[PDB]
Structures are given as structure tokens and as C-alpha cells.
């Protein structure tokens, strides 16, 4: 949900030129947060799902 909300709130500023100008006139930490956060949450959720869906934790391993 956080990733979907962030991506929607970061890339739906308007037209292509409007989005380009707005993202350009943004702070470097602000741009990083807009970029990193939406992808980071989805990636972490996918990683957690993949870890749960497997059985790599079995102790009968050599």
C-alpha cells in the first residue's frame, strides 16, 4: 500500500513536461525519497514473500 501510494503521489503530478520540471525543481534527498521509497517497499514485500514461500530454513542440510 505504501509503495502504491508513493508511486501514485510521485509520478502523477501532471503532464510529462510538468512532471519533468517538478522533479527537476526538487531537493536531492526529496528526489531520492520519491525514487527509493516506492520501489523499496515493493521489493521488501517481494523478498518477504519469496522467503516465506520457500523452505531454505530446513535443518537437514549439509
Amino acid at each position: 500500500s505504501v509503495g502504491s501510494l508513493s508511486y501514485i503521489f510521485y509520478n502523477s503530478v501532471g503532464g510529462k513536461v510538468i512532471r519533468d520540471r517538478i522533479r527537476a525543481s526538487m531537493p536531492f534527498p526529496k528526489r531520492v525519497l520519491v525514487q527509493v521509497l516506492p520501489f523499496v517497499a515493493l521489493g521488501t514485500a517481494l523478498i518477504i514473500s519469496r522467503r516465506g514461500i520457500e523452505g531454505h530454513n530446513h535443518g537437514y542440510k549439509q
Binding site: I47, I48, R51, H56, N57
Partner: protein
């Protein structure tokens, strides 16, 4: 500064690694000299001489744990490193000098440099792995991207990309095709699983590279390279010439993929792609709804063929549940004694499948009742028609029949169907071409006649003759189609020869090329066409119930090509000025006289010359491999070999007299077309005198050369 420091550090690290490997090799100083017993001087020497080695270890202690942490983050496993505390693990890993044991920085750098060297390519690796897969993938991807990126690259860019991809594909196929034909190479390449077909059945996207596939792909690729070289000439000021070229590239790629089928799903995919490519290519002028009718008719015929093929494949799968074409050919003899209860009838297992395959081929390879779409397909551009008519759409049926050769061997329905249908289709095509004034229509009817002759050859049971006829007919038809397209371009998109004439003076190159192509294609004596006709006539079997009609149709279709070729050549090049005064006079202005004067494009003319030379060389190589005393052909995978090769090796005087009768009919037709005064002329009496003098001189030469001297 930075460079000097890096050089010094690298030299120091190399020396330290050399010393460590030289001291740790004997397994005596690997821990003693490394881990000296305190002795602060020894500690300083160890951490000052191995410092370049030690620091990297500390660097190795940095990235590893972090990477391990990444693993702990990315796998939720390994329990991180809770056993350590990041101060003992770092110290242990940094102080462990066994990591840089028997490691040479210079060796690693030199090996990495040798990892990009091409001098060690060798030829056996190419033999082990055909690089033609890479070339085909590159060509397909280039075509797809050009369709997707038609804007970033202009007309010149699209042409350059497509030409580069196609030329790479053509160059790749040369040596590999030569090896396949001569060194007897075969291959099956599986591109992973493709699609789940039945419960637990996952068919894989596999391709079979065999002799037939190699030959068809080589012929199609050469024809496509020649067209793409010449297609830019015809569509000079065309609004979508890059689009036309891209469609042609897509069609060529589809034809090549269909020819390289490895499984029954691959063959169906190739047939569907060929049908879609033909439907789109015929729709060159989408703004014109008149050609849309022909496009719809062609699409309907292709869909009917695809439905028949799907039904046959479904029957085969229900019989065997195996989609591998090679395995099916190796297992087609198993279930010959079986029947399927369809409605109230019980037909043999082989009979129904063979009938379906033959019908599907007849729909694709134009036969009686299914050849209508072939003549109406002339609405496509000149290069499009050259590609469609010569091969691919026309060569689909022959290739499909040859691929399933063992299946077609034991079919009674095929046995009776193939000869009569082939002969009738060839005769009809020849007679139609003999009466067509349109260059496109004449060429299409000649192509239909050639397809009928090829089907008759397939009925003969000898594969080599079929392959030779396919190659020669395709090359010659492509050349003739290019010449006719050039003539039509000079005639302002006018294809009918009734409004043409005097173009030889306008286009000398086109006239000469058309003369050569008509001499080769029309089955004229003393050429590849004559050899193919003799081979086809040699292998006929006399057990056919309809033998008289079959023989009559074969003779009639064989004799009709020369008349049409001569008529087209004379009308276009050496007839009266039946063309409009605008076509000639506009280019007859004195101002245009310069060093660059030409009625056609130099690029098109050079492409035609190169294609003709390459085709002649390839046909000579094929005749050398097949028609010579030593059979250099690889295994045809056929267990039914006829004794018809005995006549080709050593026939009797009866076949000699039959061939003499055929050649005498040909000579009589040539004499009739040479001296028939269809119109009154100032030399009509002079023509009669010339003909009489020719007859008398021929009689005298026949008397003197065989008896007198």
C-alpha cells in the same frame, strides 16, 4: 599523482603476492612466517610487506559481511553473523593470509584480457555450435525493433539496420549450409519449454536444422537479400518504403522459421506466421479497398490451410501423443495397420492424415481449385510479389511434403492424388501463362505451372530432382519478377504488356537480364531448366490409372513456357511502340543525356546481376553434388528408394526416343514462333525466304555433320 600511486601500489601488491605464494607453497612458512610470534619488529615487517595483501583482506572483510548481510536481508537466512561481533570476524579474515595463496594479479589480468580475444575462435567450435542461431535472432530482433523504432531511425537508418541483419544472416548460412549439404550435418536445438499441451505434457520450443531446412532457408535468404537490395529501387518515392522493407523482413523471418520447424507446434506457428505476413504484405495500399478483397481471399485460403493442418496434427497427436517431427517420422511406420471410426465410415489411419496434409499443402502450394488466390495476389508490390511467388508461400507445400516424406510414402490417396493433380496444375498454369498479357499475371501463371511440375516431381519419389527444381525455379522466377517489376516501374505501375513496347532501347540491362532469366526459367533446351525437365520426365511411373491424361498434361505444361517467355520478351523489349508516348518521350528529352542516364536503378541492376551469379554458382554446386557420378548427398531419411535412378545412370533407346520426341516438339514450337507472320509486314515474304533458307541450311548441316563429316 593518482596514477603513480596506483602503479606503485600495484607493483607492491604483485611482489607481495609473489612472495606469499612462493613462501606458502611449501606449507612451511604459510603460517610461521605470516603469523610471526609477536616480536614487534616482525609484526611491523609482516604488516608493512604484506600491507597491500592485508588491506585487500580487510577490504574483503568489508564487502563480504555486508554482502552476507545483504544475503541475510535478501534471504532471511544464515542467521546473519550472530556468532561473531564484527570485531573478531574482521580481524580473523584480514589476518588470514591463506586467501591470497597461489594467486597472481598479472595472471588474472592477462587471463581477463585473453577472455575477450577472438584469435582462438577455431572452426571446430563453429562446427560444434552453428552461429546461424545468433544471426537469425539478431535479424528477428532488428526487424522487431525497426517496427517499434521506425521514428528514431530514418529511412536510411532502417534500411541500414535491416540490410546489416539480413546480410549477417545470409553470411552465417553459407558455410553451415555447405557443410550440411556436403559434410552431412544435422541438429536439434531446444529453446526451453514452450507450452503445456496435455496433462503433464510440456512441449518445448525446438527447431530441427536438416538438409531440407538448410536448403530452403538458404534459397529464401538469398532471394530476400536480393529483393531487399532491389526493393529500395522500386519504392523510390514510396510513402512507406521502410515500412514495406520491414514487412518483407518480417515475412522472410517467418518463412525461415517455418522452414526450420522442429516440432509439429513449430510447423503450425510457422504456417500461421506466413499466412499473417502474406495477409499484411498483400495489403500494401491499405487506403485501397480493392486490394483488400484479394487480401481477404488469401487470408481465407491460409486459414483453411491452417485448419486442415491443425486437424491433421490433432489426429497425429491423438494417435501418438508425440510432437517431435523427427520421432514421428521415425515412428510413422508403427501404426500403419489401424483405422479411426469417423461417423459411419472406417478409413485407414494413414489415409486420413495423408489426405489432410495433402489438402493443406494444395491450399498453400497452389493447386486446382486453390490457385485462385495466387493470381489475385499480384496487388502486392514488385518485391513483395517476387518474394511470395518464387518461394515461401509457394514453397511451403513442397517443403512440408518433403519434411514428412516417410508419412507420404505409404498413402494410397496420395499415390493417386499427387501425379494427376500435379500434372493438371502444371498444364493449366502453363496454358494460362501462354495467354496472359499482364506481366504479373503471366509470372503468376508460370509460377503455378512450376508448382504443378514440382508436385509431379514429388510424385516421382526422387527428392534430389525436387530440390534442384525448387532451387532453379525459385532463382529464375525471382530474377524474372524483378525484371518485370522494373519494367512496370518504367511503365508507371502498368503491368500489362499490351500497352508496352520498345523498352529494350530504354532499359538494356533489364532486357538482357530478362532474356537470360526467360532462357533459364522457361525450361528451354541446353540449360538447368532442360536438365530439370529431363529429370522429371525420366522418373515417371506407368502404373497410374489415368496415365494417358497425366502424360498429356505433363507434355502440354512442359511445352508452354517458351511461348510465354518469348512473347513477354518480344512485347516488352522488341515489339512496336505500344506504350504511351509519354513513357518514352519524357525520358527521350536531350537534356537527360548525361553520364548517369539509366531507365532503372544501378543498385537494382547490380543486385540482379549478383543474385543471378550467386544462383548460377549454387545451382552448379548442387548439380555437382547430386547429378554427378558420385552421389554426394547426405541421407534423405527415406527407406523407399526407387530404381528410377538407373535410367538417369543408364537408360535405354526408348527413353532416348521419347526425349527426342519432346525436344522435337519444342523445336517445332520454336520454329513456329520464329516465323509465324501474325501481322503483315514489309519483310513478310522476306521472313518466309529466311525461314526456308534456315530449313535448307539445317537439313544440309544435319546431312554433312553426321555423314559427310
Amino acid at each position: 599523482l593518482f596514477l603513480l600511486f596506483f602503479i606503485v601500489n600495484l607493483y607492491w601488491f604483485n611482489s607481495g603476492l609473489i612472495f606469499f605464494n612462493s613462501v606458502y607453497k611449501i606449507h612451511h612458512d604459510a603460517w610461521t612466517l605470516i603469523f610471526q610470534t609477536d616480536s614487534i619488529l616482525n609484526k611491523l615487517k609482516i604488516y608493512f610487506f604484506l600491507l597491500p595483501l592485508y588491506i585487500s583482506s580487510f577490504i574483503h572483510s568489508i564487502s563480504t559481511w555486508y554482502y552476507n548481510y545483504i544475503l541475510n536481508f535478501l534471504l532471511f537466512s544464515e542467521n546473519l553473523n550472530t556468532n561473531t561481533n564484527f570485531v573478531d570476524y574482521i580481524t580473523y579474515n584480514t589476518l588470514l593470509l591463506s586467501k591470497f595463496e597461489d594467486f597472481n594479479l598479472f595472471v588474472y589480468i592477462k587471463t581477463l584480457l585473453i577472455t575477450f580475444d577472438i584469435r582462438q575462435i577455431n572452426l571446430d567450435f563453429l562446427n560444434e555450435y552453428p552461429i546461424i542461431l545468433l544471426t537469425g535472432l539478431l535479424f528477428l530482433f532488428t526487424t522487431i525493433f525497426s517496427l517499434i523504432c521506425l521514428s528514431y531511425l530514418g529511412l536510411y537508418g532502417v534500411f541500414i539496420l535491416n540490410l546489416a541483419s539480413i546480410l549477417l544472416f545470409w553470411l552465417s548460412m553459407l558455410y553451415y549450409f555447405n557443410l550440411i549439404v556436403s559434410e552431412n550435418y544435422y541438429y536439434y536445438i531446444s529453446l526451453g519449454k514452450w507450452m503445456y499441451l496435455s496433462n503433464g505434457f510440456r512441449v518445448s520450443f525446438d527447431l530441427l536444422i536438416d538438409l531440407t531446412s538448410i536448403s530452403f532457408s538458404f534459397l529464401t535468404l538469398t532471394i530476400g537479400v536480393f529483393v531487399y537490395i532491389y526493393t529500395f529501387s522500386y519504392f523510390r518515392y514510396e510513402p512507406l518504403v521502410e515500412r514495406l522493407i520491414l514487412f518483407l523482413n518480417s515475412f522472410m523471418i517467418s518463412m525461415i522459421l517455418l522452414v526450420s520447424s522442429g516440432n509439429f507446434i513449430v510447423l503450425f506457428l510457422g504456417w500461421e506466421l506466413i499466412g499473417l505476413t502474406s495477409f499484411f504484405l498483400i495489403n500494401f495500399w491499405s487506403t485501397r479497398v480493392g486490394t483488400l478483397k484479394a487480401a481477404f481471399k488469401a487470408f481465407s485460403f491460409n486459414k483453411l490451410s491452417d485448419l486442415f493442418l491443425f486437424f491433421a496434427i490433432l489426429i497425429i497427436f491423438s494417435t501418438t501423443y508425440n510432437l517431435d517431427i523427427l520421432s514421428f517420422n521415425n515412428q510413422i511406420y508403427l501404426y500403419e495397420s489401424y483405422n479411426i471410426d469417423m461417423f459411419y465410415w472406417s478409413i485407414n489411419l494413414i489415409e486420413i492424415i495423408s489426405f489432410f496434409f495433402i489438402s493443406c499443402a494444395f491450399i498453400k502450394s497452389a493447386q486446382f481449385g486453390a490457385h485462385i488466390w495466387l493470381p489475385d495476389s499480384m496487388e502486392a508490390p514488385v518485391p513483395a510479389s517476387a518474394l511470395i511467388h518464387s518461394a515461401t508461400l509457394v514453397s511451403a507445400g513442397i517443403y512440408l511434403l518433403l519434411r514428412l516424406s516417410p508419412l507420404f510414402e505409404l498413402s494410397k490417396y496420395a499415390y493417386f492424388i499427387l501425379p494427376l493433380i500435379g500434372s493438371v496444375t502444371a498444364f493449366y498454369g502453363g496454358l494460362v501463362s501462354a495467354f496472359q498479357s499482364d506481366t504479373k499475371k503471366t509470372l503468376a501463371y508460370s509460377t503455378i505451372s512450376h508448382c504443378g511440375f514440382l508436385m509431379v516431381s514429388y510424385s516421382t519419389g526422387v527428392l534430389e530432382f525436387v530440390i534442384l527444381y525448387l532451387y532453379v525455379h525459385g532463382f529464375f522466377k525471382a530474377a524474372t519478377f524483378l525484371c518485370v517489376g522494373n519494367v512496370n516501374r518504367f511503365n508507371r505501375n502498368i503491368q500489362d504488356f499490351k500497352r508496352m513496347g520498345g523498352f529494350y532501347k530504354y532499359l538494356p540491362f533489364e532486357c538482357l537480364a530478362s532474356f537470360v532469366c526467360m532462357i533459364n526459367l522457361s525450361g528451354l533446351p541446353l540449360t538447368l531448366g532442360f536438365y530439370i525437365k529431363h529429370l522429371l520426365f525420366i522418373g515417371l511411373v506407368e502404373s497410374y490409372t489415368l496415365y494417358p491424361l497425366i502424360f498429356s498434361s505433363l507434355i502440354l505444361g512442359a511445352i508452354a513456357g517458351v511461348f510465354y517467355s518469348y512473347r513477354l520478351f518480344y512485347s516488352i523489349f522488341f515489339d512496336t511502340k505500344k506504350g504511351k508516348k509519354a513513357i518514352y518521350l519524357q525520358a527521350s528529352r536531350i537534356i537527360l543525356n548525361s553520364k548517369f542516364y539509366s531507365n532503372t536503378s544501378l543498385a537494382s541492376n547490380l543486385s540482379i546481376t549478383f543474385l543471378v551469379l550467386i544462383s548460377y554458382t549454387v545451382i552448379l554446386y548442387l548439380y555437382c553434388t547430386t547429378l554427378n557420378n558420385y552421389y554426394s548427398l547426405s541421407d534423405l531419411k527415406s527407406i523407399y528408394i526407387n530404381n528410377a535412378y538407373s535410367y538417369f545412370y543408364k537408360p535405354d533407346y526408348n527413353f532416348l526416343n521419347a526425349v527426342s520426341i519432346l525436344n522435337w516438339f519444342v523445336i517445332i514450337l520454336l520454329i513456329s514462333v520464329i516465323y509465324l507472320n501474325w501481322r503483315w509486314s514489309y519483310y513478310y515474304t522476306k521472313s518466309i525466304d529466311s525461314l526456308s533458307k534456315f530449313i535448307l541450311f539445317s537439313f544440309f548441316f544435319f546431312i554433312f555433320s553426321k555423314y559427310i563429316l
